[PDB]
Amino acid sequence: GSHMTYPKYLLSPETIEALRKPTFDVWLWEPNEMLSCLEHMYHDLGLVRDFSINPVTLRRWLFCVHDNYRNNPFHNFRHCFCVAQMMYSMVWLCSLQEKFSQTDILILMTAAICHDLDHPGYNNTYQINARTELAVRYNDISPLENHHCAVAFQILAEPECNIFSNIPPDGFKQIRQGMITLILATDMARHAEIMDSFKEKMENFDYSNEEHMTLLKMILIKCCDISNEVRPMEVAEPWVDCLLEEYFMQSDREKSEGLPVAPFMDRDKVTKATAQIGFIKFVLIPMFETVTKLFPMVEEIMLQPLWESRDRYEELKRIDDAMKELQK
Ligand SMILES: Nc1nc2c(ncn2[C@@H]2O[C@H](COP(=O)(O)O)[C@@H](O)[C@H]2O)c(=O)[nH]1
Ligand SMILES: [Mg+2]
Numbered sequence: 001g002s003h004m005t006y007p008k009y010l011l012s013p014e015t016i017e018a019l020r021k022p023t024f025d026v027w028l029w030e031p032n033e034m035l036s037c038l039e040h041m042y043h044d045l046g047l048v049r050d051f052s053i054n055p056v057t058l059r060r061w062l063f064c065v066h067d068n069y070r071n072n073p074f075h076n077f078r079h080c081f082c083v084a085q086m087m088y089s090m091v092w093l094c095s096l097q098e099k100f101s102q103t104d105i106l107i108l109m110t111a112a113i114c115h116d117l118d119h120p121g122y123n124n125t126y127q128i129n130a131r132t133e134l135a136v137r138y139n140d141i142s143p144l145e146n147h148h149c150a151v152a153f154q155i156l157a158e159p160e161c162n163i164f165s166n167i168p169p170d171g172f173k174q175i176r177q178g179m180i181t182l183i184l185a186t187d188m189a190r191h192a193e194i195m196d197s198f199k200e201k202m203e204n205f206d207y208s209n210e211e212h213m214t215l216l217k218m219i220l221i222k223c224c225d226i227s228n229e230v231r232p233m234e235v236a237e238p239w240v241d242c243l244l245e246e247y248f249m250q251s252d253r254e255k256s257e258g259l260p261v262a263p264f265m266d267r268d269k270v271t272k273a274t275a276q277i278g279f280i281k282f283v284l285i286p287m288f289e290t291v292t293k294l295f296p297m298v299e300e301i302m303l304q305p306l307w308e309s310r311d312r313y314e315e316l317k318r319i320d321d322a323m324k325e326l327q328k
């Protein structure tokens with residue numbers, strides 16, 4: 001709605017407004033547009049200003065991150081963009097700048113962007129069981145997340161991509177430790193442990209307690225990572241097919257190599273509906289419920305879509321089941 005047309009990488013004022021909300025349609029954009037969105041978040045959150053980030057270095061760094069995401073069905077650059085954009089949305093929704101330092105916001109955002117770098121499209125159980133170079137390297141201890149974090153800092157060690165080059169060394173060490181904690185916290189094998197520790201702190205939560213805040217940041221990055229079903233149905237639904245593409249590719253490989261197959265990745269057992277109902281009911285809703293105790297506005301904006309998704313997937317399953325009552 002402007003007097004002339006601007007290239008797509010120049011975000012419209014309407015796109016900029018939209019970007020602040022969990023309703024943002026992540027499928028509309030090419031990589032160069034997504035890179036411009038991420039760039040805008042760093043400026044808009046005041047991180048360029050407060051960390052003296054060279055604006056060109058911000059752009060090279062993002063271009064380099066993009067390049068180091070693989071073209072997997074799910075664990076790709078558009079996914080990193082979703083996770084970051086949801087983090088950015090939560091900053092606004094939960095008024096996080098009132099609660100967290102700029103350093104904490106920087107850690108949250110940078111970790112979100114970097115959390116799945118160079119993901120191979122086969123999970124930790126595959127790495128461990130197949131005794132891959134990654135599993136050997138990391139001694140079966142969250143091999144992928146250790147890798148993501150190591151690539152993050154390999155990129156940041158290239159001077160033309162070092163967005164932290166103007167931060168003093170003590171600042172760098174703080175950010176580095178925080179980002180490592182957050183990226184390692186995205187390993188779902190630790191979900192129940194991390195939830196348990198957080199709920200423990202929630203018995204008497206304290207924003208001035210560093211251990212409480214680390215746990216909260218771990219919950220935030222976890223929320224954003226697995227947040228697809230918070231999005232409008234039309235945005236959320238295609239992500240499920242992408243995830244099952246990766247899962248089926250893995251379970252096929254495991255059967256072929258004689259390795260254990262998880263029932264939740266099994267072409268024969270799993271549907272879109274059965275995959276999401278349990279994940280929404282038993283992982284997503286309880287996690288967002290605990291967050292809503294600190295941030296009551298999370299209920300309307302994030303829990304409501306999850307309730308609706310749960311409900312719709314139950315309907316689907318009923319018709320999927322009936323369909324299978326015909327095809328045998
Ligand atoms: N069933 C299901 N699992 C999900 C969904 N979103 C994320 N996850 C799981 O949570 C994990 C989060 O780690 P990620 O690999 O995305 O960093 C994913 O590997 C995936 O297995 C979802 O919408 N449905
Ligand atoms: Mg991951």
Ligand SMILES: [Mn+2]
Nearest residue numbers: 079115116225
């Ligand atoms: Mn992820």
